Design a protein around this nucleic acid. Sequence first.
RNA 1: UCACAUCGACGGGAAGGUUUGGCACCUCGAUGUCGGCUCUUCGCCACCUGGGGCUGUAGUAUGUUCCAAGGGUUGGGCUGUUCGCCCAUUAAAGCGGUACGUGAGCUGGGUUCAGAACGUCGUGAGACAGUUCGGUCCAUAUCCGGUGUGGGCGUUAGAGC
RNA 2: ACGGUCCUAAGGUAGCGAAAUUCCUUGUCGGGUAAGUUCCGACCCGCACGAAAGGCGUAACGAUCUGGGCACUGUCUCGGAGAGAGGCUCGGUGAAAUAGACAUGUCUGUGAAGAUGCGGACUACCUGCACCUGGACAGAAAGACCCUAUGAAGCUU
RNA 3: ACCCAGAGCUAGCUGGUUCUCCCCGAAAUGCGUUGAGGCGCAGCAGUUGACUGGACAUCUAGGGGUAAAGCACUGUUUCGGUGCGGGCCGCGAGAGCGGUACCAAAUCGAGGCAAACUCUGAAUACUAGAUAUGACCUAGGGGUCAAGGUCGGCCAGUGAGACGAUGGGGGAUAAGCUUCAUCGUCGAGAGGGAAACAGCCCGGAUCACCAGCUAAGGCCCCUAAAUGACCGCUCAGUGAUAAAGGAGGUAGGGGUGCAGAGACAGCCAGGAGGUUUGCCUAGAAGCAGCCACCCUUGAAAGAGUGCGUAAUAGCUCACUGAUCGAGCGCUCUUGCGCCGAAGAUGAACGGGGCUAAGCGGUCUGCCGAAGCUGUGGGAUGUAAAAAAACAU
Lengths: 108, 135, 107, 37
Amino acid sequence: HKKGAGSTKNGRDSKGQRLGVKIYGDQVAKPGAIIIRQRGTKFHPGKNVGIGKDHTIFALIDGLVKFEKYGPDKKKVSVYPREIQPENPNSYRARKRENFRLQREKKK
Amino acid sequence: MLSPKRTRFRKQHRGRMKGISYRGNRICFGRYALQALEPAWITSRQIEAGRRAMTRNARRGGKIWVRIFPDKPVTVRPAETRMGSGKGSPEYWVAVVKPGRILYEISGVAENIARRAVAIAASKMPIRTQFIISG
Amino acid sequence: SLIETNTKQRMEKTIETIRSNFNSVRLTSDRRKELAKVVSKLAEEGKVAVRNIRRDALKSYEKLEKEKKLSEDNVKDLSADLQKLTDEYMKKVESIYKQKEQELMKV
Amino acid sequence: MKIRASVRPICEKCRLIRRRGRIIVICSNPKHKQRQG
RNA sequence: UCACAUCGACGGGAAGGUUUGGCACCUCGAUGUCGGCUCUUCGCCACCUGGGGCUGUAGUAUGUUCCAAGGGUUGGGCUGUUCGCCCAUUAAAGCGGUACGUGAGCUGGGUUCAGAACGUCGUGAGACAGUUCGGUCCAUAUCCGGUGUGGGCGUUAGAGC
RNA sequence: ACGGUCCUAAGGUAGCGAAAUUCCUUGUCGGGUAAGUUCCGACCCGCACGAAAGGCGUAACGAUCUGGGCACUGUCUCGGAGAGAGGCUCGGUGAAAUAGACAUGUCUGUGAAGAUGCGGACUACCUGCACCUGGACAGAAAGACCCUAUGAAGCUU
RNA sequence: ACCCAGAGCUAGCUGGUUCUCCCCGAAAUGCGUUGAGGCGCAGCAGUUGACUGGACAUCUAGGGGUAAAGCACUGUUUCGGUGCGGGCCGCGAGAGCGGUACCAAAUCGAGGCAAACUCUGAAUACUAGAUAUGACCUAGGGGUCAAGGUCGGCCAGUGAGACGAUGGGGGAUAAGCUUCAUCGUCGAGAGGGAAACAGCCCGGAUCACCAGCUAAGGCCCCUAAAUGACCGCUCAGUGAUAAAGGAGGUAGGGGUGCAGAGACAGCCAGGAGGUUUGCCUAGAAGCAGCCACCCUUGAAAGAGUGCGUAAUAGCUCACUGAUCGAGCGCUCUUGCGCCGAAGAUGAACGGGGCUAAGCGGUCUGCCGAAGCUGUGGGAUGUAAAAAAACAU
């Protein structure tokens, strides 16, 4: 009734190395910000963009990230600064942060 | 015993049997056919035993075809043994059949006799099958 | 675990030896008691010849325990399986014995 | 008589009838006489 | 001759919780482990005894299976043994649950202490559901529960039959 | 019985052998009994006897182990009767372990999965005394088994 | 050995740790550990400072390879057609070769499968950016409140989790089993529904009222509310408990075959000569197995669906006349029932009981919680203090 249990020859792994897209498409970046840790060139380097020893793709300039279409079934990544970025005190966020600030000041 | 010939990997998961079988609905060879309703894990012993019993009632002529081939393995662990310590060896191979799938096809006998035959072949199997004429 | 084959197929040869013994030994009702003297010994040497196989097997597995290929978990498994197998083919010895013992009265 | 869970006609002169929730096959034969199920 | 008197291959589907397991949920400020004695009771999946259908039922004697659990289901040899085999019987020598019923009822042969030995494993101390001989079984019944047996009161005025 | 070949320091001589050693196993054969998993003699497949951790025999001796017989009987079939010491009643003296509180039924269901206490039923005036032990997971000893503690202690190389 | 002393030895171990009210309120996870029932740091509490704006809601943009699907790749696979190459036989016995009851590469056509396959590719989720004024005052002014994070100081517990839904793994797609991922409840949560019943459903207990409305669930009696309504269904005590299979039980729907030039079921009728048929000559003779499955005589008949024979013989059923005179025969589909359905102290739907007081569908009343409403009282916080609210 009490038979022996056979050992395995498995049970080894490496904890997920945390690759993938760090800075997404149409998003803020920096000079030096790592955009993608990819194991090979899944995405390819575009304009304004360095490519490192590990095929790590990082931005050289400010601006928003762009994942372009390369030609025959591949992907690029370029970075573009943005011209004018308007802010209106009309809006809800602007209204509410000024309301909050004014409450803070009013209390103390 | 319709066993697969040297597959990729030894042991594999159970998954499950959602959905209706869409593809194996059509009939190719036969004019009459046995079709499944409830999903099940059909061993090769059940297939072979259905094929034999259906063949016995062909008699004078008319050809029979099988349209389900097991592929998936199943392991029972070493009998009377505690939990854990790896998987077991695969005992038998099974066909994952879903609802509305062809199991056996037959042509070239009188509709009298085919229907009689598939009753036996239904009786050998673990599921509520049904008779279907189309081709 | 290549002992299984060696221990296994020799039982067939043992059965064949028993059958060869039964081939040679083929009178009044008191004289059919005298054939039970020689017929018994065939069965006895059959049973001894079954036993000696399992003796060889367990003698191998003792060494396989000391040499440290297996351990005390696997020796119980193999002991169980060969306990089953050796007493499985002893029922064949008993059955073929009954084959010959029922022929003295009937045929 | 038989007491099967399945009660089918065996003789071609066999019947089926219900007396007190049963299903009884009555033939002209004695051997095809069966009850239940 | 004939699947369906009687068996039923390859296969399929159930219930039961008596076996061997899996789990580790109550109990480690203790719920005594086997077998025997004593004394129960209950279940039916019926060993015999009552009443049936079918029979490859001439009768006798069966085989099979339906109803039925009221009653019954011996005495020894061997083994600690339950189990088992055997002798002499017999209508028959049913199978299970109840903490594998019952140790604040009994027993202590088996198995879980210390001694000692054989085989074996161990360089050694020691070890081995391997074997052998020897080895302390508590209790004045509070309550429930039971078998008996009183007393009070009740039964509408009180009594004896 | 007879040879071939390998390894090893060397491959068990005499004797004994299913034994206090034997797993398989109630080995098989014969004796003993109506029937004998124990017993006696023989076989040898000695799992894993073996020559001073002696080998094998041996008259005697044993609150030694283990089989069989005669005599003997309540050991038993299968109980029965009687005598004392208690038990029982009366008077005198007068403990104990135990004890959350106790107004402390049975059935089945439920629940930390085995309920006097929770649900539904059933049963049941209140209260002594004699007897009986099935339950209160009754009492007794912070399990002696099992495992844990970077606990303790003996003993070994 | 004992006795005294070091010595209140140490014990990551067990037990125990005493007055009251108010406010907030966890965790049972990750990481490391001679560590696994301990500890450290993170995560999640409290408390007190600093920095700002989010939160919930809707709408865009991003990269995903999962469910799905698919067979172009990687494997796997069945059948057919083309068929290199292979199996076996035949020759004027060393040059030479031809047959071929045959297994089959590679492509083509049809047809499947795949956690570790993808020419494809959802929903969610994740990241980012955008847009919207939550409750109380005469479309704003000025008001009152509630409403989330980041950083740091001081100072905790936790680090045994459990069940349920889903996605999976292990197991036997067994377990009140085990291990992860996302969410609910318990844990730490009373109350009502579930007979009793942590974990299911409803709902979050500041306190008082012999007021009211409702949620979940219910309205024969035990026991609050309809022995309410209208239309269907069951005949089983189903309504409490399980399958394969069995079936003129009963109700409805559609489709399908014949039928007062008369069907169905009963009812005397007919149901033939070569057919001893060729066949393995022992016989298969309408009926072991073979094929052929004639055509005549005809109101009709198959060289035969079954019984009966060594094979014949014989008995039927197909069909058709005749008698007869109205709806009947064979499938499909459901709805609600029956059998299949047997265990140990005693009935077990909660009980009584019910033919509805059960099931289905619809319509309206009512009951029903500590939920919400009303009426009063307390304490917090919004500042400091009182009134006044808003929230708690």
